[PDB]
Structures are given as structure tokens and as C-alpha cells.
């Protein structure tokens with residue numbers, strides 16, 4: 001895969017944010033994970049939703065560097081959102097959330113699953129430590 005610089009525009013929730021990419025603002029959705037809902041009335045404000053939002057927000061706002069890393073399949077979803085692994089100062093936000101028990105590994109659609117095993121391994125650790133979503 002290949003990392004590319006991006007610039008934080010606005011953090012939306014635990015797994016969605018707006019970034020300035022290649023000169024254009026665009027909204028991104030983290031690959032292979034799912035943080036709890038805080039918007040959509042169908043899901044309502046799910047537990048740990050606000051926690052995941054705060055974790056992500058903090059991590060991306062205090063970063064000196066943000067990088068996007070597309071996987072090997074499609075780069076956008078049906079809503080026009082960019083699909084990527086996002087790094088804040090070299091740390092993958094996707095993994096950071098899973099490791100804390102603030103997200104579950106989800107929407108694993110190949111071939112966009114290069115980091116699936118790494119992420120699951122962290123989810124297992126968060127799980128055995130009964131962290132947040134797993135408590």
C-alpha cells in the first residue's frame with residue numbers, strides 16, 4: 001500500500017471525518033472497522049459512540065501529520081466516501097480504536113482487507129481485556 005499526506009478539515013465521529021485530499025475536501029470512512037453511531041435515528045446514539053468520537057477527534061486534531069492509505073480495491077463507498085487506513089503521526093487510527101474496545105472489526109469486503117489480520121489480533125486483545133464495547 002502507499003501512504004499519502006492529507007490535512008484534517010473536520011472530525012465527524014469515531015469513524016468518519018473530512019479531509020483535504022489532493023487539493024479537494026472529501027469525507028473519509030475508516031476501512032475494516034465500525035465505531036458506534038451517534039447520528040442516524042435508526043441506530044440512535046449507541047453506547048460508546050460518543051467515546052469513539054472523542055478518541056478519534058483527539059487523535060486527529062493533535063497530530064502533526066495525517067496520512068491516508070487506500071487498500072487494493074475500490075476507494076470510495078456508495079455514499080462517495082473515501083475508504084482508507086488513516087494514520088495520525090504514524091499511528092493507524094483504525095487499529096487504535098479497535099485496540100481500545102471503541103470499535104469492532106467490520107465490513108470486511110475483499111480485496112480491501114490487507115490489514116484484517118492485524119486489526120482482528122488487536123480486537124482479540126481488547127476483548128480478552130473486556131475493554132469498553134467488550135466489557
Ligand SMILES: Cc1cn([C@H]2C[C@H](OP(=O)(O)O)[C@@H](COP(=O)(O)O)O2)c(=O)[nH]c1=O
Nearest residue numbers: 016029030031032033034077078083107109
Ligand atoms: C467501512 C465501509 C462502509 N461501507 C458501507 C456499509 C454501510 O452501508 P449502509 O449504509 O448501506 O448500511 C455503511 C456503514 O457505514 P457507517 O458506519 O458510517 O454507517 O457504509 C462500505 O460499503 N464499505 C466499507 O468498507
Ligand SMILES: [Ca+2]
Nearest residue numbers: 015035036037
Ligand atoms: Ca460509525
